[PDB]
Design a protein around this ligand. Structure first.
Ligand SMILES: [Cl-]
Ligand SMILES: [Cl-]
Ligand SMILES: [Cl-]
Ligand SMILES: [Cl-]
Ligand SMILES: [Cl-]
Ligand SMILES: [Cl-]
Ligand SMILES: [Cl-]
Ligand SMILES: [K+]
Ligand SMILES: [K+]
Ligand SMILES: [Mg+2]
Ligand SMILES: [Mg+2]
Ligand SMILES: [Mg+2]
Ligand SMILES: [Mg+2]
Ligand SMILES: [Mg+2]
Ligand SMILES: [Mg+2]
Ligand SMILES: [Mg+2]
Ligand SMILES: [Mg+2]
Ligand SMILES: [Mg+2]
Ligand SMILES: [Mg+2]
Ligand SMILES: [Mg+2]
Ligand SMILES: [Mg+2]
Ligand SMILES: [Mg+2]
Ligand SMILES: [Mg+2]
Ligand SMILES: [Mg+2]
Ligand SMILES: [Mg+2]
Ligand SMILES: [Mg+2]
Ligand SMILES: [Mg+2]
Ligand SMILES: [Mg+2]
Ligand SMILES: [Mg+2]
Ligand SMILES: [Mg+2]
Ligand code: NA
Ligand code: NA
Ligand code: NA
Ligand code: NA
Ligand code: NA
Ligand code: NA
Ligand code: NA
Ligand code: NA
Ligand code: NA
Ligand code: NA
Ligand code: NA
Ligand code: NA
Ligand code: NA
Ligand code: NA
Ligand code: NA
Ligand code: NA
Ligand code: NA
Ligand code: NA
Ligand SMILES: [Sr+2]
Ligand SMILES: [Sr+2]
Ligand SMILES: [Sr+2]
Ligand SMILES: [Sr+2]
Ligand SMILES: [Sr+2]
Ligand SMILES: [Sr+2]
Ligand SMILES: [Sr+2]
Ligand SMILES: [Sr+2]
Ligand SMILES: [Sr+2]
Ligand SMILES: [Sr+2]
Ligand SMILES: [Sr+2]
Ligand SMILES: [Sr+2]
Ligand SMILES: [Sr+2]
Ligand SMILES: [Sr+2]
Ligand SMILES: [Sr+2]
Ligand SMILES: [Sr+2]
Ligand SMILES: [Sr+2]
Ligand SMILES: [Sr+2]
Ligand SMILES: [Sr+2]
Ligand SMILES: [Sr+2]
Ligand SMILES: [Sr+2]
Ligand SMILES: [Sr+2]
Ligand SMILES: [Sr+2]
Ligand SMILES: [Sr+2]
Ligand SMILES: [Sr+2]
Ligand SMILES: [Sr+2]
Lengths: 132, 337, 160, 142, 172
RNA sequence: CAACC
RNA sequence: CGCCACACGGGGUAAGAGCUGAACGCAUCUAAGCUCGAAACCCACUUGGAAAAGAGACACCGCCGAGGUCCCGCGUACAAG
RNA sequence: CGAGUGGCUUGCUACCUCGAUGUCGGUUCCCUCCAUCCUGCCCGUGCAGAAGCGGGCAAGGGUGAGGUUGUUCGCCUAUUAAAGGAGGUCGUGAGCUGGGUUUAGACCGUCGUGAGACAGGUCGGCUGCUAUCUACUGGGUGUGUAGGUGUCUGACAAGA
RNA sequence: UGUCCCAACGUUGGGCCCGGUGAACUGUACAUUCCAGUGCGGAGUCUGGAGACACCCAGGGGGAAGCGAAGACCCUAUGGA
RNA sequence: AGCCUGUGUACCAGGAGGGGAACAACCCAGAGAUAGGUUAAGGUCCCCAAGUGUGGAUUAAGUGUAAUCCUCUGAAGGUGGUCUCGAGCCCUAGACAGCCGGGAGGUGAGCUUAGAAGCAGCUACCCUCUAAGAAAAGCGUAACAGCUUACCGGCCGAGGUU
């Protein structure tokens, strides 16, 4: 993928439960897999800010519940490092549901997003209210 | 089904024993290209700090922007090429033929060797030039040594001696180039060889850790879950199969870890100066203060503070040189805190 | 079942039907092919397929080699071409298999084979000088389906 | 460095195994032998199969060790060692009074031993010790 | 067996050891003709290829040596030439001689140029869409011709559709 | 699959 | 869990693509010869390595004194050593 | 239909061991094989392209995480370039585990007049030892080469 | 929630060195082994090669089909209970 | 099956010594002690005692350098790799191959068909010119065209072909 523009310490693994920062009707997402990732023996697959992941809906509306969808990680509690040396961290871990074309399934994003996630997913960004 | 997995640790840096010479010894040298010139230099590690640099990379989306970069401060005072050794090619490889020494010696070079009192530089030179006429001359190298005394933070006064190859134009020309340096007094500096922005390979003897177990030394797993409470926590599963009925040298075991020579490739020289611009408030921890000739190396360098590190023009650079990077800031914030 | 199991003559002759029951039927459909209403003498050419090693040929092998041979002759000369081929051997030797370890091992009956001594003619064809190379080709295909190496020997035929 | 050899053999265009066999015999009879121009010694056969065999010896080994030489120098001496009971007193004495050299370090020219010569005009399927060494990865210092 | 080849008046052939050198107004060609028990020599105004052995393998090389020598005769006088035509469908292919190698650019629209070094003192001249490879050494010349053609070889796609490339039009 | 069936 | 560094390029081949080329006047990538061609082989690079018994090389110092040991203060080292 | 190769399964034999060579699966750690799953380079195509399908060279490297089940295997899920197979006493209990198997307690079904039986099921159920030799990982003292200091060479050796 | 990803640092007692005290297990012999082979088919000792200068310290236990217990399974006995 | 179970015999068991790398029963050999000599099996380039023996031929794969065998594999099938022997036929009245030239008219046969002209299919398959040249052997075309095989001549010159 296109360089992210910052170094990331993945703060999530397969199985982690995160916030769905949108209005798709999904409230909580479970990480199932990480796009393009391949680990090593015994290593739990990890995902962090900027990765595209496959998720299952754990909490939300009946129609959304249990659906296996694609998403993009927009916030994480574990710090990331920007070119100027500063570390950046969020209040929670969150992702936004996305389609085949990486366009947000929802109409609105909830909460801030990392600028780096913009470079990658512009259409996701063109839905963000706050970009930090 | 027993999943695959690469083995633990590299088999390419063995045996993992205590280094024989604390002074690093390059086992390779740059190729002959430019004008004749000494292919290396040395200094003493002081510590680290960081600097803000203007992205120099012409292919980076950030070209021309502020960028914080880690730097290891190495004190690199002038050294003294004290002699010119000549190697001759033989059926059994390269062998020392003779050496051409000088008269002017640093006041304390006698703390390491028996300094010459009676030597014939012309007889030696004569034998060398005849070797060249015959076409039996191998490469040409300079016996070099440091001046620890010039570095206050380093307690040693005894000079560290190393042989550094001289490459360059034609042999005849670099032979003459070698002799010129030596004759003077051999005194040369970091500037004379490197330029800020070029890539250097740094060699040094890593920090010693004495005896350590397989987990730390080779990176094998610790025993997991229930297997961690029965009496075995940091011991590998087994030393090998029933057959072969012997333990292979490839199974990870305890032993000396650290204090090994390492040659780290493509280290970018961020800046070569002199003074106290890089020094840190309160002084570098366990080292002291810097106020003299110094070199800022991008990233990390093997070895503890005070150890002798060696520089050599990168023999396998991946990127082209982007000379004299613009340094907008050099942290002097205390390293204690 | 592999032929390695029965190709050798390493057992007594076992052919007495009065003391052997449950013998499977032969898979050989015909022993006389071509125009069997005609005599072998009415032909200028006689070519035989000679076995080079002594062996036992299971009826399943005779059928396949005979089949792949006559079949070629039918394709190259027609369902009624002017020729006649004969398979002169019949599978008289009864075969067994022990299919309880080595206890009471005498095997149950599973098939039949014909014993052929090295040098003997397994097949013999009779044709006109024209269809001489067609029979030599039918035999090349036949010996590819029977254990031993074979010689394609041409008897009456000085038309070389 | 100085070797008073009673005999100086020239291995140039000579069958390695046949020279070796004779040098062993003489060495056992008390002769001090110096084999010269080892890089030019020769071994008959198809280069590809010959090299496969010497490469196999190079790859063989383990902790106990199977140090097989790559230089024509050592290849030839090892060849000779295999024709001597080098683990017995007399055998080691004989082997140690035999030396092989790249080129000719002497002033005299070695003699060509009868029956060991290879006629290049009558042979195309053969290889040179030097060629084998190069393939093995040795540093052609000759 | 013995074969005698009368050397052309335009030519003069000298030989030492296993090497044979042939020179003419068009240049010179030196070759090594080494095979078990086959002796090649220059006896006056003729080149002689002879051997005491007459087995199939020996007869094969003798006949091979003859043709090689006759080709050298021809090369130092008439010389050797191969003709080539550069054909392309969609992307205009640039074929030029630079230094000791023929460089091709924009092949199938490729950004990277394809190239090959010319063998021997072989000369390569291009006139529009036509190329001519010539020289005294048939080996060097023939290979250079072949190399240029191989230089535009394609394995990835159907050749029946992608035919771009330089081809040997006339063989000597 | 680690004896008895 | 943080940070740094870890090629390109040569040489010889396999499968394969070809050149010249005869046995076999032709043809033929092959029989002799040759041009190419794999993450694979060799070199490049890193690490160990005078106990390599052919047990090595060079320079200087010293043989009434060069150098070294004990001793003392200590760690860039360290389970004893 | 015919001819073979392997020694991963199963069967057969009873050669070795009953004054004992600990028994499945897993785990950990090391080496290997190639009949190649991916990666490199090729050939053909019912090869336009993209992509398939089949074939060749090739063992350098890689071949991962999860749900049921003691399971091996297998079925299933999301990832992946691919998530290949096999040997090393079915490598590995003087390394681990003890779920299964494999005593003594107990129950069910079936069998037995009964005691009691069941690679049928089910709950519970113990794992000793201070390393002599050898092997290897690292660390020393001596001798040999034959006064000392410093600097090297490079036969060999290891690497993905 | 360090069971795990994936391991880190620290604490106390040992471990290591020194004074003193001071056992046991085990021992046909020889024994520096490694790769193959052979052999009653599962060899440090036989054969062929390879490697191997002696001694000592620490270590984790690959091998000695390691030590410990005349196999408790299975069968056999004109055995026992 | 280094399996089970018979039979005759010699061997191991209970049999040394020599050979076979090692190797109960494969080879020589049956053996008091000691000594000289000559052989057996087996071997004679070195390790290791004796040949780098002689005449000759084949093999280029390191095939092979392996009597026997749990132990030494190598099969059906294939081979213009190479060596040797034989048979038929053709050839200096010029063979086989190659290269050059000619390959023609009635007529694009008749039939079928809108059309088919060597070559969709069916039938017939005749004679002129001539040194040859099919009512056409293989491609090719919507059908022609076009490219070639047969067949004839030339150049060349020695064995060629089955
Ligand atoms: Cl996953
Ligand atoms: Cl574990
Ligand atoms: Cl080794
Ligand atoms: Cl010996
Ligand atoms: Cl040859
Ligand atoms: Cl007797
Ligand atoms: Cl060989
Ligand atoms: K039991
Ligand atoms: K037992
Ligand atoms: Mg696991
Ligand atoms: Mg700090
Ligand atoms: Mg701070
Ligand atoms: Mg038994
Ligand atoms: Mg045991
Ligand atoms: Mg393969
Ligand atoms: Mg495609
Ligand atoms: Mg491997
Ligand atoms: Mg096991
Ligand atoms: Mg064990
Ligand atoms: Mg246990
Ligand atoms: Mg224990
Ligand atoms: Mg249970
Ligand atoms: Mg249970
Ligand atoms: Mg039971
Ligand atoms: Mg008992
Ligand atoms: Mg019992
Ligand atoms: Mg009783
Ligand atoms: Mg007895
Ligand atoms: Mg002898
Ligand atoms: Mg062989
Ligand atoms: Na324990
Ligand atoms: Na075990
Ligand atoms: Na029974
Ligand atoms: Na040879
Ligand atoms: Na080796
Ligand atoms: Na290459
Ligand atoms: Na088999
Ligand atoms: Na297990
Ligand atoms: Na591989
Ligand atoms: Na599972
Ligand atoms: Na076992
Ligand atoms: Na246990
Ligand atoms: Na187990
Ligand atoms: Na903890
Ligand atoms: Na052990
Ligand atoms: Na007897
Ligand atoms: Na013996
Ligand atoms: Na061989
Ligand atoms: Sr395993
Ligand atoms: Sr050095
Ligand atoms: Sr080195
Ligand atoms: Sr336990
Ligand atoms: Sr073993
Ligand atoms: Sr039988
Ligand atoms: Sr057959
Ligand atoms: Sr001799
Ligand atoms: Sr090829
Ligand atoms: Sr030494
Ligand atoms: Sr026992
Ligand atoms: Sr293979
Ligand atoms: Sr592939
Ligand atoms: Sr199952
Ligand atoms: Sr199993
Ligand atoms: Sr249990
Ligand atoms: Sr069960
Ligand atoms: Sr039960
Ligand atoms: Sr000694
Ligand atoms: Sr031995
Ligand atoms: Sr211990
Ligand atoms: Sr001889
Ligand atoms: Sr002979
Ligand atoms: Sr066996
Ligand atoms: Sr056999
Ligand atoms: Sr065959």
């Amino acid at each position: 993928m296109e360089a992210l523009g910052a170094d990331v310490t993945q703060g999530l693994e397969k199985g982690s439960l995160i916030t769905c920062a949108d209005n798709t009707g999904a409230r909580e997402l479970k990480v199932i897999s990480v796009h393009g990732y391949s680990g090593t023996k015994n290593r739990l697959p990890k995902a962090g800010l900027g990765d595209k992941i496959t998720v299952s809906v754990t909490k939300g509306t009946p129609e959304m519940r249990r659906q296996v969808l694609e998403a993009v990680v927009v916030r994480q509690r574990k710090p990331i490092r920007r070119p100027d040396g500063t570390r950046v961290k969020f209040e929670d871990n969150a992702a936004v549901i996305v389609d085949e074309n990486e366009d947000p399934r929802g109409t609105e994003l909830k909460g801030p997003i990392a600028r780096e996630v913009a470079q990658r997913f512009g259409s996701v960004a063109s839905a963000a209210t706050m970009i930090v | 089904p027993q999943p695959s997995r690469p083995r633990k640790g590299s088999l390419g840096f063995g045996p993992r024993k205590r280094s024989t010479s604390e002074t690093p010894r390059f086992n390779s040298w740059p190729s002959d290209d430019g004008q004749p010139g000494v292919q290396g230099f040395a200094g003493y590690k002081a510590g680290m700090t960081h600097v803000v640099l203007v992205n120099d990379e012409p292919n980076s989306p950030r070209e021309g922007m502020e960028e914080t970069v880690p730097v290891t401060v190495i004190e690199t005072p002038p050294m003294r090429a004290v002699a010119l050794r000549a190697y001759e090619d033989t059926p059994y490889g390269q062998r020392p033929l003779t050496e051409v020494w000088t008269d002017e010696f640093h006041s304390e070079l006698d703390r390491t060797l028996d300094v010459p009192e009676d030597h014939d530089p012309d007889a030696a030179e004569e034998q060398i030039r005849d070797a060249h006429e015959a076409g039996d001359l191998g490469d040409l190298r300079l016996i070099t040594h440091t001046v620890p005394d010039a570095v206050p933070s380093v307690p040693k006064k005894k000079p560290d001696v190393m042989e550094t190859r001289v490459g360059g134009g034609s042999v005849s020309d670099r032979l003459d180039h070698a002799l010129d340096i030596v004759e003077d007094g051999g005194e040369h500096a970091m500037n004379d060889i490197f330029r800020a922005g070029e890539y250097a390979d740094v060699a040094g003897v890593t920090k010693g850790k004495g005896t350590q177990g397989p987990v730390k030394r080779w990176g094998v797993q610790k025993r997991k879950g229930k297997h961690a409470r029965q009496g075995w926590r940091r011991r590998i599963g087994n030393l090998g199969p029933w057959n072969p009925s012997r333990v292979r040298s490839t199974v990870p075991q305890q032993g000396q870890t650290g204090y090994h020579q390492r040659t780290e490739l493509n280290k970018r020289l961020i800046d070569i100066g002199e003074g106290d611009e890089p020094t840190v408030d309160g002084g570098f921890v366990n080292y002291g203060e810097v106020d003299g000739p110094y070199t800022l190396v991008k990233g990390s360098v093997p070895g503890p503070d005070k150890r002798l590190v060696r520089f050599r023009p990168a023999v396998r650079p991946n990127d082209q040189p982007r000379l004299d990077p613009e340094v907008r800031y050099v942290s002097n914030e205390s390293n204690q805190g | 079942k592999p032929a390695s199991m029965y190709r050798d003559i390493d057992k007594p002759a076992y052919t007495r039907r009065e003391y052997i029951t449950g013998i499977p039927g032969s898979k050989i459909a015909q022993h006389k092919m071509g125009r069997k209403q005609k005599d072998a003498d009415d032909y200028p050419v006689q070519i035989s397929l000679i076995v080079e090693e002594t062996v036992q040929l299971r009826h399943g092998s005779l059928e396949a080699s005979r089949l792949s041979a006559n079949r070629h002759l039918i394709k190259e000369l027609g369902e009624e071409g002017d020729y006649k081929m004969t398979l002169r051997k019949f599978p008289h030797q009864v075969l067994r298999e022990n299919k309880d370890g080595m206890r009471a091992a005498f095997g149950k009956i599973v098939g039949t084979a014909a014993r052929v001594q090295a040098g003997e003619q397994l097949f013999t064809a009779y044709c006109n000088v024209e269809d001489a190379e067609h029979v030599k080709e039918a035999f090349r295909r036949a010996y590819n389906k029977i254990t031993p190496s074979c010689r394609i020997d041409s008897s009456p035929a000085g038309n070389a | 460095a100085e070797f008073d050899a009673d005999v100086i053999v020239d291995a140039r265009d000579c069958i390695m195994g046949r020279v070796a066999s004779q040098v062993a015999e003489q060495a056992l009879d008390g002769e001090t032998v110096a084999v010269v121009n080892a890089e030019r010694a020769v071994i008959t056969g198809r280069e590809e199969q010959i090299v496969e065999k010497y490469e196999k010896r190079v790859d063989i080994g383990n902790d106990n060790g199977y140090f097989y030489p790559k230089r024509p120098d050592g290849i030839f001496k090892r060849t000779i060692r295999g024709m001597l009971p080098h683990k017995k007193q007399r055998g080691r004495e004989a082997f140690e009074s035999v030396r092989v050299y790249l080129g000719n370090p002497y002033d005299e020219d070695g003699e060509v031993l009868d029956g060991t010569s290879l006629d290049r005009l009558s042979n195309i399927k053969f290889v040179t010790l030097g060629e084998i060494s190069e393939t093995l990865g040795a540093n052609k210092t000759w | 067996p013995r074969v005698e080849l009368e050397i052309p008046e335009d030519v003069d052939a000298e030989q030492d050891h296993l090497d044979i050198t042939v020179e003419g107004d068009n240049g010179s060609v030196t070759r090594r003709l080494w095979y078990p028990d086959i002796d090649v020599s220059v006896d006056g105004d003729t080149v002689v290829i002879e051997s005491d052995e007459d087995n199939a393998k020996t007869m094969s090389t003798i006949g091979t040596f003859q043709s090689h020598i006759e080709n050298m005769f021809h090369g130092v006088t008439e010389g050797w030439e191969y003709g080539m035509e550069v054909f392309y469908s969609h992307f205009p292919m640039q074929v030029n001689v630079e230094g000791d190698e023929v460089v091709i650019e924009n092949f199938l629209g490729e950004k990277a140029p394809r190239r090959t070094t010319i063998h021997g003192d072989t000369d390569v001249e291009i006139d529009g869409e036509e190329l001519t490879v010539s020289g005294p050494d048939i080996e060097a010349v023939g290979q250079t011709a072949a190399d240029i053609e191989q230089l535009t070889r394609i394995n990835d796609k159907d050749v029946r559709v992608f035919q771009d490339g330089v081809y040997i039009t006339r063989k000597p």
